[PDB]
Structure formats: structure tokens, C-alpha cells
Write a protein that binds this ligand. Structure first.
Ligand SMILES: Nc1ncnc2c1ncn2[C@@H]1O[C@H](COP(=O)(O)OP(=O)(O)NP(=O)(O)O)[C@@H](O)[C@H]1O
Ligand SMILES: [K+]
Ligand SMILES: [K+]
Ligand SMILES: [K+]
Ligand SMILES: [Mg+2]
Ligand SMILES: [Mg+2]
Length: 299
């Protein structure tokens, strides 16, 4: 931190204590955030932000450099061939993917399957020239369970059928039970803490994304506050995904809010499930057929 202009030893200490440890957070911070640190003037605040942006080369980029940025995105396999295809490879890091679906469509299954697949290194697709092994080494998952449907048994099961050690999945997945939107949001904001503590958080699951908000803001006479809070929650999620190059998944029970990728899942015949990609920034809408068995997502 003392590398930054306007940052002395005493200032560095305040910064690390206020949770500002890495350059990107400072580079992307506002003067307000930094001035609420006490002992930090605005001039010093503005100087370090400018410095952080420069040390992180956050300026205009063109030509080939535009390709390199996009190459830092790695993807997580879903164990479904058709789904990975419709996804253009698999679930993208640096983005928020949503699986909306009717009751029992498999939203929660996909979340569990994703935590398991994170532990199979061959399920993380990436350009080894833009993403080093170390960056995806000892990957960990954060599971914000708002429904109370996290099932370690399902994790163990999905894991064995994948030839992955179940306990290892459990040992590398942080679960937080949220009972309302307040807890749901705070847990997400605290993910930074797990990372500063040395945890290579690469997957974040929010199941469910909307249940709490709908339950608390029932009265459609204050839907504004609702949209606001949630919007702020999505901002936090998108930033988290970009800055920590990790995949963010969210579920939504349906039978408006921000989401980079949008799916609507429905039940087919028995095992069958039909997921429809109806919105994304660079891919055409498409359908993916797969099934949910004792092994998890397959085909
Ligand atoms: N151990 C298992 N073996 C085989 N199939 C399973 C197993 N566990 C769950 N399933 C399937 O997963 C379905 C439930 O998927 P689920 O992820 O709970 O849907 P959902 O969309 O999250 N439901 P909801 O949260 O209520 O809206 C079941 O009804 C089973 O068909
Ligand atoms: K300095
Ligand atoms: K079922
Ligand atoms: K979108
Ligand atoms: Mg993003
Ligand atoms: Mg569910």
C-alpha cells in the first residue's frame, strides 16, 4: 500500500483496517468511501485512487488488448454437454448467471452440482496463457442458502459419481444460511473477507436470489425500495465476480432485476429438464436438454 501516492505507513494501517488491502478496491473506490476512514483527507483519498488506477493500468485499451481482457474469463462445466454448449463453453466467471425455473425444476440441484464440479480441475475451462494455474488453484465455493435446502448428502453423492472426493468438496465450500434479504446481502458483502483471509473464492451461489425480497416487500406499495435494495445487491455481486474473477450463480423461482445470463428451466419427462437461455450479452437464445439423476446433472 505504501507504493501508492499519498500513502504513508500510518495511512496504510488505517486502510488495511478499513478493509482496503488490494489496489483494485482502492482503484475502484470513491473519495467518499475513503474519507469515511478518518485520518484520510480527500486530497490523499483522490491521490491514492488515481495512483491505484495507474498502478493497475485502468485506462483506455484497444486492438489486441481488448482480446486479452476477455481471455481472463474462465468457465465452469455443468456436467451437461448441451448446457455447456448453449453457455458457449460453461458458466462464465466475471458475470452473474441466473437459473430461473418453476417449482422443482432443479435450481438447487444445479447449484450443488456447481460446487462439486469446482473441485474437478478439469471442469474449469480457461486460456492458460491469460489465466495461470495458481489463480485457479485450491478453488473454493460460497453458498448462500436462503431456502434452507443445502444438502451435504447430495454433495457427497454427486461427488462420488464424478470420482471426486466428497469431503474435499465440503471442506472447500462455505455455506451461510440466510433468513432474510438483510442476511443474504451482508453475507455476499462479507465474501471479500473470506478472500482477504486467504480463501481462493472462485464460485458464489445465491439460492434463492429473490425469495427473501418477495417475502419482505409483499406490499406492492413500496416495490421501489425493493428494486433498489436488490439492485444494490446485484451491483455487489457483479463487482465481486469481476474483481475476484469468479463465477456467480443465482436462482429465481418463477411459474425485474439485473442478470448477465438468464435461464428458465422446466421439467421434461421424468429425468428430463429443459433449460432455455433467453438472455445473454454475446450468445443467441437456445435450448439445452439434460437430466437430473442420482449422479446430478448429466448428458
Ligand atoms: N439424490 C437424488 N437422486 C436423484 N434425483 C434427485 C436427488 N436429489 C434430488 N433429485 C432430484 O431433484 C429434484 C429436486 O430438484 P430441486 O433443485 O430441489 O428443484 P428446485 O427448482 O430447486 N425446487 P424449489 O426450490 O422448490 O423451487 C427432485 O424432486 C429429484 O427428482
Ligand atoms: K507512498
Ligand atoms: K422430481
Ligand atoms: K443480460
Ligand atoms: Mg462482469
Ligand atoms: Mg430449490
Amino acid at each position: 500500500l505504501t507504493d501508492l501516492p499519498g500513502v504513508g505507513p500510518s495511512t496504510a494501517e488505517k486502510l488495511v483496517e478499513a478493509g482496503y488491502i488490494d489496489f483494485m478496491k482502492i482503484a475502484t473506490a470513491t473519495v467518499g468511501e475513503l474519507t469515511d476512514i478518518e485520518g484520510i483527507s480527500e486530497k490523499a483519498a483522490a491521490k491514492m485512487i488515481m495512483g491505484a488506477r495507474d498502478l493497475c493500468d485502468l485506462g483506455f485499451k484497444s486492438g489486441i488488448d481488448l482480446l486479452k481482457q476477455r481471455s481472463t474469463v474462465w468457465k465452469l462445466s455443468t456436467s451437461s454437454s448441451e448446457l455447456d454448449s448453449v453457455l458457449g463453453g460453461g458458466l462464465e466467471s466475471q458475470s452473474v448467471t441466473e437459473f430461473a425455473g418453476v417449482f422443482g425444476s432443479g435450481k438447487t440441484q444445479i447449484m450443488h452440482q456447481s460446487c462439486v464440479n469446482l473441485q474437478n480441475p478439469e471442469f474449469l475451462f480457461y486460456d492458460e496463457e491469460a489465466v495461470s494455474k495458481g489463480e485457479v488453484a485450491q478453488p473454493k465455493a460460497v453458498y448462500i442458502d436462503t431456502e434452507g435446502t443445502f444438502r451435504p448428502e447430495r454433495i457427497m453423492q454427486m461427488a462420488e459419481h464424478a470420482g471426486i472426493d466428497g469431503q474435499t468438496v465440503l471442506d472447500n465450500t462455505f455455506v451461510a444460511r440466510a433468513y432474510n434479504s438483510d442476511m443474504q446481502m451482508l453475507f455476499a458483502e462479507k465474501i471479500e473477507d473470506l478472500i482477504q483471509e486467504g480463501n481462493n473464492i472462485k464460485l458464489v451461489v445465491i439460492d434463492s436470489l429473490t425469495s427473501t425480497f418477495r417475502n419482505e416487500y409483499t406490499g406492492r406499495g413500496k416495490l421501489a425500495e425493493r428494486q433498489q435494495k436488490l439492485g444494490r445487491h446485484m451491483a455487489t455481486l457483479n463487482k465481486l465476480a469481476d474483481l475476484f474473477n469468479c463465477v456467480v450463480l443465482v436462482t429465481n423461482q418463477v411459474s425485474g432485476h439485473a442478470a448477465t445470463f438468464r435461464f428458465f428451466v422446466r421439467k421434461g419427462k421424468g429425468d428430463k429438464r429443459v433449460a432455455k437461455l433467453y438472455d445473454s450479452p454475446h450468445l443467441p437464445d437456445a435450448e439445452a436438454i439434460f437430466r437430473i439423476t442420482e449422479k446430478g446433472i448429466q448428458d
